């Protein structure tokens, strides 16, 4: 077992969407080049302030498989480090990333080499073949444990956060809006409906937890969790948000306004098709 049990995170890790995008691009291109989803290996850079680690950027590393062992081209890694020194100096190396499921007996050796490079490296692994709604990204640290009298390096999962700025928020929101738009129009409402589907599923899961807890309380558990079930009942009474004549007046007001706007858009599309039809018809038989 390469995973430490009972070990809590000692440092805080902040991750940015750029790292995730770089990992995804590396995995996608390596899959395209060599068929199956070939595992990728890269490096993490950013700013570290004491126990607060912020991973702002990530890049790729050259690796070779010899004697069934992944050997990281640490000379390539240092050359690219000096290359990044020419563009960004405030960013310092923090760790390395890879793709896959649970840790394998090949990532331990790579993390051993990276810990040979720097003082304290961070290990991140992404799962591109996930099926759950959770983020398939986990951050692990290096811990030394005495197993059977021998010091064996293990991985301890870190309760990392995901930090972003206003700039990245706006940019990624724009990219999401673009993904709403299709090639010509591949899928536009599909992403929109799945987007609300995830939100409803998130709330639906919360309702199940409350419902199960009440059912258990009816049989066992605490007979009354006090302010919790009292409030849980109050939220089932607040569930029917009472609407008056004015709210339905305004709700129908908004629906009619944009519905008319939707009608105008259909007319604009229809006349363009008519204009294209007329232009083609004026060449089909008509002259002048």
């Amino acid at each position: 077992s390469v995973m430490a049990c009972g070990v809590t995170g000692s440092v805080s890790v902040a991750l940015h969407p750029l790292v995730i995008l770089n990992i995804s691009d590396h995995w996608i291109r390596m899959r395209s080049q060599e068929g199956r989803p070939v595992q990728v290996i890269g490096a993490l850079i950013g700013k570290q302030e004491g126990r607060n680690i912020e991973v702002m950027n990530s890049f790729e590393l050259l690796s070779h498989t010899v004697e069934e062992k992944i050997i990281i081209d640490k000379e390539y890694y240092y050359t690219k480090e000096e290359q990044f020194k020419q563009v960004f100096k405030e960013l310092e190396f923090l760790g390395w990333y890879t793709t896959g499921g649970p840790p394998d007996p090949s990532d331990i050796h790579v993390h051993k080499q990276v810990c040979e490079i720097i003082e304290s490296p961070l290990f991140l692994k992404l799962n591109p073949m996930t099926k759950h709604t959770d983020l398939p990204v986990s951050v692990f640290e290096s811990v030394i444990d005495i197993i059977n009298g021998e010091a064996t390096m293990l991985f301890a999962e870190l309760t990392y956060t995901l930090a972003t700025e206003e700039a990245e928020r706006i940019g990624v929101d724009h990219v999401a809006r673009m993904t709403a738009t299709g090639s010509g129009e591949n899928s536009t409402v599909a992403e929109h409906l799945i987007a609300q589907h995830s939100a409803i599923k998130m709330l639906h899961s919360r309702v199940k937890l409350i419902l199960e807890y009440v059912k258990a309380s009816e049989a066992g558990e605490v007979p009354f969790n006090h302010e919790i079930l009292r409030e849980a009942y109050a939220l089932c009474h607040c569930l029917p948000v009472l609407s008056t004549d004015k709210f339905k007046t305004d709700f129908y007001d908004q629906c009619n306004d944009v519905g008319l706007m939707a009608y105008l858009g259909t007319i604009t599309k229809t006349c363009n098709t008519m204009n294209q039809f007329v232009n083609k018809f004026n060449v089909l038989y008509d002259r002048q």
């Binding site: 589907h197 639906h204 309702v207 419902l211 007979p223 006090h226 089932c236 009474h237 009472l242």
Partner: protein, 214 residues
């Protein structure tokens, strides 16, 4: 500090009871802050009082947990006489129930359900309840309506659980219905994309056939 005092009273009720327990119940109903009485009702000494000879205080506690102000008015003889704090707390609980059931409360309902003869007294009680962080909302005097944005809940131990389970089941069924509806619309959108795609290669196949013809 209402929760801490209620927990202390719970711990004391595990021991001393009887006449002392009635004094503790009176203190609870007189001390402001305790808006939830479900914690006290489940104590075994409350059941001991239920089999005990004294029942006026237990009926008062049961009405505070489940009943409202009109129930107390009807039971004005069978219940111990309340103080100003107890009456204000019971009126607050009644207003809480009204707000929980329906959010925009007309003044007529407030006057009818609370023996409020003067509307000024109604305004004073409403502002007192709001300022003690019990209910959050707004008042419309021109329409004589009390718009309550948020309110606390009531006690649930014996019979409201089935209604809560039914309400939770209805919410779960409604969420599943919307989830299925979204999936159907996504499938319909994919079919429309396929139909739009199907119309496409037919045009290119029509174009390429003529290109081969010429």
């Amino acid at each position: 500090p209402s929760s801490n005092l209620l927990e202390q009273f719970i711990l004391l009720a595990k021991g001393t009871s009887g006449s002392a327990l009635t004094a503790l119940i009176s203190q609870v109903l007189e001390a402001p802050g305790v808006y939830v009485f479900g914690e006290l009702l489940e104590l075994a000494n409350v059941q001991e009082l239920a089999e005990g000879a004294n029942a006026a205080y237990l009926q008062l506690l049961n009405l505070f947990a489940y009943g409202t102000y009109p129930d107390y008015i009807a039971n004005k003889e069978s219940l111990p006489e309340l103080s100003t704090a107890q009456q204000n707390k019971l009126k607050h609980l009644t207003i809480v129930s009204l707000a929980s059931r329906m959010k925009c409360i007309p003044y007529s309902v407030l006057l009818k359900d609370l023996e409020m003869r003067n509307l000024r007294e109604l305004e004073d009680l409403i502002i007192e309840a709001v300022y003690t962080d019990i209910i959050q909302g707004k008042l419309d005097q021109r329409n004589q309506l009390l718009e309550v944005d948020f309110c606390i809940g009531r006690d649930i131990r014996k019979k409201d659980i089935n209604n809560i389970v039914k309400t939770l089941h209805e919410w779960c069924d409604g969420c599943e219905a919307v989830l299925l509806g979204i999936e159907q619309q996504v499938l319909r959108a994919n079919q429309y994309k396929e139909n739009h795609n199907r119309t496409q290669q037919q045009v290119e196949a029509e174009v390429t056939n003529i290109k081969k013809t010429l």
